[PDB]
């Protein structure tokens, strides 16, 4: 199976890069 639950935790990571 998979842990898509992280699909919602990979935000701050993608964000920090959205501006830096």
Curated annotation (Swiss-Prot):
This is Magainin-2. It comes from Xenopus laevis. The chain holds residues 129 to 140 of 303 of the full protein.
